[PDB]
User: Which sequence fits this backbone?
């Protein structure tokens, strides 16, 4: 059931902001690896003496990469006179974030009807404020509250092109790469304690529990009214045999933070062909593929949704498949995006739940823990 | 004249080490942009709990990219028990370097006959010590002295594959990229005061002045006995009309540091074709090309070294050409490698001075300041 308890009007995921040491190199690597085009910039060339910020887009997916310049360039500025295009940015906060966590997501941004109202309502309902609502060029309002760890939930609302102060990117520097990724499907946090994290976020958003769940973790998913904003949260399970990967995350990340971004593709076969061609020439690596037994077991599980040829294409690309009582999920996971075994990416595509497609169709792949373990056991048994 | 005054036996440039926020993303970007293969690693997967270091190679050119992990991973270690493969590494030094300067070169490494002797002689002759000689696996010795700013000159000597503790890279992650780059030709520093910088470095190395030189800078070049290790140093010229780019460097870098790396190609035409194909898909951008008048003027200057077709190929690729009384230089410059207008790369190839080719054949392109200015003036005149 969906109680539709959102305490303010939420639209969709708007962007994800990475805090970086060098935004240029991370943005260029991600552009080539994921097939995202350079779409906007705010940096020295646009008069920003504070931070370098580069926007990549693929369809509706927006990835922002931000790094601080020397504070000496802006030493005479005050907030009323800032040349920063993102008024919540702070040199010390950014350097401290990156020193503590390494490369990772600082902001999960959702578009709302009124960022000032969303901020006020959130804080009235327990949200810890991070940056107050600030109106940019009387046209866009931005506000930030703490989500978990040093990750913020950023509210953005538009009166009527990314943010004022950003410039569209020179067409010769904007190569029209596109591997089929179209939007952010969900964004997942790792925390030490799931219960208090859920109570806090659901407390100030009104987001309701969408789903939930003996291998490493406990998880639950918070969702907006139309279930298009999806925020799963994990905690570690202590007392196992293999060490919890959630605990490994928390250790290497120095605490809670964003674990993975799941990116919807309109053609997951094409996306994975293109990404895998580039893994060893600057792109992203993928997790080891499941054994042949996993794909033999796919016939009995999804033989009514996917043809034998489509299942063979999943096998060639290492794609995992899970299913709901309503829809089917195709998914695959990258290796970590940077030096630390912390943040990674998931590529997904969902089949079913046609009404437009309902959010979360097919679930999040929890059934693939069991199915993977079973297939590994069968493959070693084949010996 | 060459006094051959080296105070210890120097062989050749060995490697350049970048200090990074995230080594993975910088290394992957550079690999694709420059056509360098992933050759060795030292990181969590090799038991290094301290730093992540990735080695790229192209021919004899070695680029090392290093970033710190959370200090919590190695908190129980002491130097006698370190898991770091580069014993001079320090978390605080690396974070402070990167916070101050952004992405850039920490170490210019030269191979010497005996790194302990080179270190002792250097310090006896005025070098400021940075890291004492440390023997790794009774097989390689490494030592470091201050060069300028926070850049060190690193001595490496081998008893008889990069460094002990590094592992050769998995062949599936080692794509054999190669755009023709073969070695480091020279490495250039920017300092506030050229005179004291020259006196200091020549003081402790015995390197002699190779060359020297009204547009922005004063420069001089220090060279080893066989003039294969070449270290130009620049200072700003104050009082001009256009602001000194050396002064802009010092401002955005927070002081002295490495300005550019000049990479010799065995086929500069192929290297630039390959690099330019990749500029807008994750690689490196190049400076704006000279006007058509520059290439018309090339005929009268190097028409005896380069055919008309070869000059047209230089024009298609934006390559600059200068000449000595002994040799000819083909060169081109990238835009800055990262967020700040600080470090950039030069691709070069030298013609002449055949004996093997003598080091520095054709000079460093100082004649192209005048020639560029003249050609820009002629092109606007063509109007
Ligand atoms: C991340 C994820 C989801 C997911 O999206 C998700 C949510 O959206 C919300 C609900 C909670 C949740 O989970 C769903 C299914 C997944 C995965 C996933 O990440 N992965 C791969 C893996 O576990 O990665 C790793 C990582 C580190 C390892 C270290 C050591 C290992 C030693 C042996 C075997 C391993 C297998 C996988 C391993 C590792 C090991 C999977 O298989 N499924 C099937
Ligand atoms: C870097 C370099 C060398 C070189 O290797 C070298 C050494 O090895 C040792 C000896 C000293 C030395 O110098 C030789 C020749 C060069 C260059 C070189 O860097 N460049 C390009 C440029 O000046 O870059 C820039 C950078 C920033 C600018 C900001 C604003 C500008 C406004 C107008 C015009 C510009 C032109 C160039 C500009 C800029 C402007 C060149 O043309 N030659 C011809
Ligand atoms: Co997921
Ligand atoms: Co040069």
Assistant:
């Amino acid at each position: 059931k969906n109680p539709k308890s959102d305490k303010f009007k939420v639209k969709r995921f708007h962007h994800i902001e990475f805090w970086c040491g060098d935004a240029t190199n991370v943005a260029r690597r991600f552009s080539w690896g994921l097939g995202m085009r350079f779409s906007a910039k705010s940096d020295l060339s646009t008069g920003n003496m504070v931070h370098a910020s580069y926007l990549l887009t693929s369809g509706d997916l927006r990835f922002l990469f931000t790094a601080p310049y020397s504070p000496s360039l802006s030493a005479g500025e005050i907030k009323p006179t800032t040349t920063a295009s993102i008024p919540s940015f702070d040199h010390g906060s950014c350097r401290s974030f990156f020193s503590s966590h390494g490369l990772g997501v600082r902001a999960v941004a959702i578009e709302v009807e009124d960022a000032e109202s969303a901020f006020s309502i959130s804080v009235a309902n327990g949200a810890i404020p991070s940056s107050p609502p600030i109106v940019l060029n009387e046209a866009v309002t931005i506000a930030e509250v703490k989500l978990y760890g040093d990750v913020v939930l950023r509210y953005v609302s538009y009166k009527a092109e990314f943010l004022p102060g950003f410039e569209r990117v020179e067409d010769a520097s904007s190569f029209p790469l596109d591997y089929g990724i179209r939007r952010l499907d969900h964004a997942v946090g790792n925390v030490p304690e799931l219960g208090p994290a859920l109570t806090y976020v659901a407390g100030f958003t009104g987001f309701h529990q969408f789903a939930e769940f003996e291998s490493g973790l406990n998880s639950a998913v918070l969702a907006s009214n139309d279930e298009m904003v999806l925020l799963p949260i994990n905690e570690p399970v202590h007392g196992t045999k293999r060490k919890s990967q959630i605990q490994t995350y928390l250790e290497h990340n120095e605490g809670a933070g964003l674990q993975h971004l799941a990116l919807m593709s309109e053609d997951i076969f094409r996306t994975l062909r293109e990404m895998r061609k580039r893994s060893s020439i600057g792109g992203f690596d993928f997790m080891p593929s499941p054994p042949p037994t996993y794909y033999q077991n796919l016939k009995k599980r999804v033989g009514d949704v996917l043809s034998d040829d489509q299942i063979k294409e999943c096998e060639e690309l290492g794609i995992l498949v899970d299913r709901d009582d309503q829809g089917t999920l195709l998914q695959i996971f990258t290796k970590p995006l940077g030096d630390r075994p912390t943040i990674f990416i998931e590529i997904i595509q969902r089949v079913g739940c046609m009404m437009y497609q309902s959010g979360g169709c097919g679930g999040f792949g929890k059934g693939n823990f069991s199915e993977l373990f079973k297939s590994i056991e069968e493959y070693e048994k084949t010996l």
Chain A is about 25% helix and 35% strand. Residues 179-383 of chain A form one domain.
